[PDB]
């Protein structure tokens, strides 16, 4: 999997 941070917001792919 992968952890994404987009301008402070956390998401998982």
């Amino acid at each position: 999997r992968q952890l994404i941070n987009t301008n402070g917001s956390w998401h998982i792919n």
């Epitope: 999997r1 992968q2 952890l3 402070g8 956390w10 998982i12």
Partner: antibody, heavy 123, light 107 residues
Framework: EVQLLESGGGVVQPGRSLRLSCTAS????????MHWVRQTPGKGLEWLAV????????YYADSVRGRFTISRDNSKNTLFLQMNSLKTEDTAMYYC????????????????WGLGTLVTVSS | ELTLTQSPATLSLSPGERATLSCRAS??????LAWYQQKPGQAPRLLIY???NRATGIPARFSGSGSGTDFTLTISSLEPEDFAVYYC????????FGQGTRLEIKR
């Protein structure tokens, strides 16, 4: 039982570097994201960095980005925090913490903490 | 820049009573809020995550609720071990912590 063992604390001079380590036992380390968080009585708890399942997948607080590096060696079950260009303001208790890591669909919460390593930055 | 503010700063109670703690965010964090307990000279312990979910092994006497900018932790049937500091944490935008609420023994 779940265990996070941190390196012992001590003193380091301003400007120098210091690498902290945290070694996991009692669970499958590779399956968990990990974090470093520090604490001072004056400024409270401050998150510093996360590393996810893939060892190249990392994030950092604005305050330490480009100064600190987080890394993991899965074969040794060890998490590192490499701190460079240390200032007296970096004096703190340094905790490693395990992320809840998608267990029950949750992430970016600290479900297990080490006892901490006390770092004193002083000349 | 997201700030969490905890109240009361200090709570004075006796074992067996109920504590009610509050965490307020400067802007909405949806349900992205957790609560930690920290006993003196020890590591923090995760109590509640996603505002209302108990961490594995955490007793129901720790109960979390709220959303947006307003959150509450209640601790029922206080135990001797529960007199400690409690912190909230958001993960809506980066990761920040409240400044803590101190629970002490009334006399």
């Amino acid at each position: 039982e779940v265990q996070l063992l941190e390196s012992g604390g001590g003193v380091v001079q301003p400007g120098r570097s210091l690498r902290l380590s945290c070694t996991a036992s009692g669970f499958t380390f590779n399956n968990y994201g990990m974090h470093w968080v520090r604490q001072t009585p004056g400024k409270g708890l401050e998150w510093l960095a996360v590393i996810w399942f893939d060892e190249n997948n990392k994030y950092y607080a604005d305050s330490v980005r480009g100064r600190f590096t987080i890394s993991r060696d899965n074969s040794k079950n060890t998490l590192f925090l490499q701190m460079n260009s240390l200032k007296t303001e970096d004096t703190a208790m340094y905790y490693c913490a395990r992320d809840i890591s998608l267990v029950r669909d949750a992430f970016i919460y600290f479900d297990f903490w080490g006892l901490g390593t006390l770092v004193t930055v002083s000349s | 820049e997201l700030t969490l503010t905890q109240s009361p700063a200090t709570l004075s109670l006796s074992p067996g009573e109920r504590a009610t703690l509050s965490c307020r965010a400067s802007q909405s964090v949806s349900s992205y809020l957790a609560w930690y307990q920290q006993k003196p000279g020890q590591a923090p312990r995760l109590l509640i995550y996603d505002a209302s979910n108990r961490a594995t092994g955490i007793p129901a006497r720790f109960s979390g609720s709220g959303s947006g900018t307003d959150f509450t932790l209640t601790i029922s049937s206080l135990e001797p071990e529960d007199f400690a500091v409690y912190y909230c944490q958001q993960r809506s935008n980066w990761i920040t912590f409240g400044q803590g609420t101190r629970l002490e023994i009334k006399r």
